[PDB]
Design a protein around this ligand. Structure first.
Ligand SMILES: [Ca+2]
Ligand SMILES: [Ca+2]
Ligand SMILES: [Co+2]
Ligand SMILES: [Co+2]
Ligand SMILES: [Co+2]
Ligand SMILES: [Co+2]
Ligand SMILES: [Co+2]
Ligand SMILES: [Co+2]
Lengths: 253, 253, 253, 253, 253, 253
């Protein structure tokens, strides 16, 4: 076998990718999302009740479909990153990155020694298909994509430094965490927040990195797409399930 | 503790109850559905990948919420009915009931001896709260509700006989199974099928039993409500998840 | 490896075995029970939320301990009996056996062809340890023990006939199901029920079969032991958990 | 989406398909098997500790790979067949089929009314991808493959009648169950058994049906392939795991 | 919906709350405990085999009952605290807190920015009921209760400083960990240990914080209640299961 | 009950122990491995998709068999070590140990206060059998075995210092991680790497500690055994499953 191509990583330089947040934490729910035709599915290890085993189940579900899997771990924990890479997550979104030093550690966490600190266990990994991908240890990093979240004042305070870290492919803006950090908790739509978000996207693209964001607001998501944002998540499965069931009940109260 | 009141059973004679089909087969997904405010939630053991243990998890999720749980077993299997009653399902929807003889057996499957054939195991059952409901064996049947599905030609051929079975509280019409049985598979909206459905509802109500149905077609569900149908399911969680995710993506293709 | 010796089966002719009912339906809870030192543990597939996979987990937990496992399936279903024997259950307790014909079918369900109708799949079975027990197909029935429950009027009406079925090792009396069948539901302690139970135990032992019963009443269990009853369960894990927690709270209300 | 093509069904008339038995009962173990390149993988619901939910997990694992999934239910149970078809199993292997009457019932169990008795629940089914395959109810049977097992004397006594049932695509010979049925339990390699197996394969192919078999004996599997047998399973995952680990330990004792 | 009121938090100033330790690590076992009527149930993530997903199941089980859930994470890990708050745990018990600096970090871990460092993900959280609690981000901290454990010499060495940390609602004394720290491992009943425990309880209450403790010794628990200790756990589900089963067997040996 | 004897620990000074790596992450797969007769089974928490609960299931499976269980956590995390010891893992293999300071912390993580920092929770632990091992808190450390991995340049740079840490029973060499650290990633068989491995084994044994290693290369494993290496793992379950299934298919292509 040849390594699974990371089409998400390739498309960061070629097109705008439309994303769905997957927080239903379940292989069956992930499969339903995988049938829709999103460019990418974010399997949320930070804000949905997921662990390594439930994330594997959702990777296996999604693998039969063209949608690309991106995994968010609960934090930039180097041993957890090792685990998520070995179950075969090729794209990682690290929350709350706040310095070039932390971003560089996340780069190393995704690369084998001697260049990085990724633990070597290819015989056991779905990532190498249990060594059925015969050159995995030589080729693996070619198909690994590292994304970091800037979603705090310290992140924005270190934005230019993070954007100069080789091996950070993309910076993703978290409007919920960022708006809270700016004293506008629950109000990311405020002009003060939006102006910082737009300027941040412009600086990310000016440094030649992919910019990303999540907004369930269609008008905001379209504006971010108009600015050239490379990876835009446009909704959340738990939110769409709850809203569609409420909207239906309201037709009958 | 006193037995859990079956408000679904009580409301069959007092109001029209709006239902959501739950086929996401998961305690977390059942909890999301429970937050919406449907009168009843159908935990589908027939057409979703559920077993006794997954149905228990969804009963436990839903129990904290006013929505009433109704469980559909895969078939009118007497030992499976015993299991679903012991985990505390108070309302059952039996598929593909086709004779008064079978409807009578389903009544007995829901009642303790000497009147019925429900197996006795109160010490172990969530239904008795492990005997914390101290008079459970004397009071249990008062809060059990039996619904049967008429959804085949043989069902319709035995409708008057099923409607004279004491202890059948409601007859639910299955438009997918019935339209297929009538040679209109995938086309329940056909006049031939709808005239049979309307007449069946009228006959159910004329015999003093509750009529029920599922339609994801808003206009059909409203017409069934105008005919006085007591329990109408208006949607399915898997369908609402898939449709809402497709509708969202099409705003961005 | 040699087949696991069924010490429960051997002890039916040599001693009185003290049993605990296991309905907490979980490998961790079965392990706690296994540490106590009961002669036997009944893994309840009829009245606890168990399936083949949860029964297997509890067999694996209990296997490290001297307590012998007995499995009760939800009904005398021949394919389920096949499944439970292949995961390695050596003793089965069949509920609600009501004729010699049914008891004979249960004997056959436990024996390989050409004598029986047990399906042959030793390569896949924990029962053969995946053929690591090299003569399993020749020796298996030697360590299989069949118990049937008499717990209905039809059972008592067929008692002498069931007691003449070769390969039924034991008849277990179900006081909850039997007292209900006799119109004394929730009142097995009634003299009318107890006289029938005592005569039934005497008839079982006079036919040279093992007699069994469950009573959480200490005085009743001791009387059954004084009558020579070979296998007596004296309590239920759910009941002991709930009672011990209620008794503790009442010291502080 | 268009229905998933059943390449196993198509290849019954075009090539000889090499099969692996999957009894490790686990989505992760199924995925390892799926990477090898077998024509087909038999997910064993009869002799491995599987239920509908574990079979779904293994279908989802295997779906990303060219290996075709075949599911064996525990018995020819019509409601269980309904469940396995709805989770999207396109090929079923029914154990212990013994008459044309039972084989015809298995055909109907796989077809929608009005021709068959398959329960209609497409909105909820992975089989229709939750109605994302828009014509599923019209096209489904085109990609459904029914295989039946002849593995008893009554089966052989009804072989010519089973082979005249339209909609039986293949007859699979079970050498373990059949050798036991013939009084050669654990000795399928005996000439008396092999001569019956060869004659049975010849009669299956002469009636224009696909013949199938499992043998972990390489010489027997090659002989069956030389006779023109269309689907040959050549090993079992539990057996290969145990034997490879024993063979390795013996190099070091 | 309005936020779930934290009655445990309210009752810290109004009454003495009787608690049960829940380490059976299972939704079914947590439900049995919830039926007893304890003021609070401690879901033990530190010393029972629990993870985020098993804690969620137990929160769902307990939610239908008046008993208030308190969750103990394995350590004061800020990302894990984030996960446990998002699945809807409103009261946390942090083990082995040893400084005001650590206690202050635990306060921040429980509060949204800009005041705290709790990660913002309300759309995905059971805590907000997937935003069905419409003002969750504004009101959440009102119903969050932080308890810290003092159970080491360094803890006692920093007791006055921890007791001056605003947002620590309660200090829980761990007699097993503390007695071990004092060189009296397995001997918390020693006078040297008890005098330190009594003085610690008096100092906690003098600083206007709630004092808590666990003792399975009835005499010790009653003395702690007489001292005015606000939250006293009086037993452990694993201990009561094992003891009740041992005590029963000993009546029959 | 007396504490479970750690025969692995005892045999470090009396014989050479042959090991199998268990990364199939499942109680059923661990049981198959346990039937083979390996001296020890490595339950891999670092490079297989295991968590505390899956590791418990595999401990419970293996417990009925003479094979000794050794657990590798994902990292030298003190709270995770506490969890794995409480579920009853008596031998731990800590990855990527790089200093005497870290090795000393791992020793303390395995010992109760006042000597160590292992959290005290015997009532809840399978390790004490829920206090059914009555003197557990006094005797536990006698049967705990700590192994550390040297598999980086910093490890080798601190080898003499790690080898002088009392309570480190064994140093295990990780050829995959070490060969990558040395710039020979995927090529541990290189002379440069092997000369370092041989010298490291000699130094470990000269300091009176047990040396260990994994090699799936039979000739390398036999050479390590000839050098006197005390604990040698000779294969991996995922690798043996994949290779045996590939080797079988290639006989038929
Ligand atoms: Ca299951
Ligand atoms: Ca888990
Ligand atoms: Co964020
Ligand atoms: Co229907
Ligand atoms: Co009974
Ligand atoms: Co067979
Ligand atoms: Co403590
Ligand atoms: Co390593």
């Amino acid at each position: 076998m040849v390594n699974t191509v990371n089409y998400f990583k390739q498309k960061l330089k070629t097109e705008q990718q439309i994303g769905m947040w997957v927080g239903l934490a379940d292989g069956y729910c992930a499969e339903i999302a995988a049938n829709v035709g999103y460019d990418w599915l974010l399997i949320d290890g930070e804000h949905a009740p997921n662990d390594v085993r439930s994330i594997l189940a959702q990777l296996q579900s999604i693998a039969a479909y063209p949608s690309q899997a991106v995994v968010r771990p609960v934090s930039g924990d180097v041993p957890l990153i090792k685990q998520l890479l070995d179950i075969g997550a090729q794209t990682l979104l690290i929350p709350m990155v706040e310095s070039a030093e932390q971003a560089e550690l996340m780069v190393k966490a995704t690369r084998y020694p001697p260049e990085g600190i990724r633990g070597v266990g290819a015989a056991l990994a779905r990532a190498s298909r249990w060594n059925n991908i015969s050159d995995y240890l030589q080729t693996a990093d070619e198909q690994i994509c590292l994304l970091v979240q800037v979603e705090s004042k310290k992140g924005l305070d270190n934005l230019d430094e993070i954007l100069n870290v080789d091996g950070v492919d993309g910076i993703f803006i978290g409007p919920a965490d960022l708006s809270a950090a700016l004293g506008y908790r629950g109000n990311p739509g405020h002009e003060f927040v939006q102006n910082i978000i737009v300027q941040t996207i412009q600086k990310i693209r000016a440094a030649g990195k992919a910019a990303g964001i999540l907004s369930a607001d269609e008008k905001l998501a379209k504006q971010y797409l108009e600015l050239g944002t490379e990876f835009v998540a446009v909704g959340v499965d738990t939110s769409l399930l709850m809203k569609s069931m409420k909207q239906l009940l309201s037709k009958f109260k």
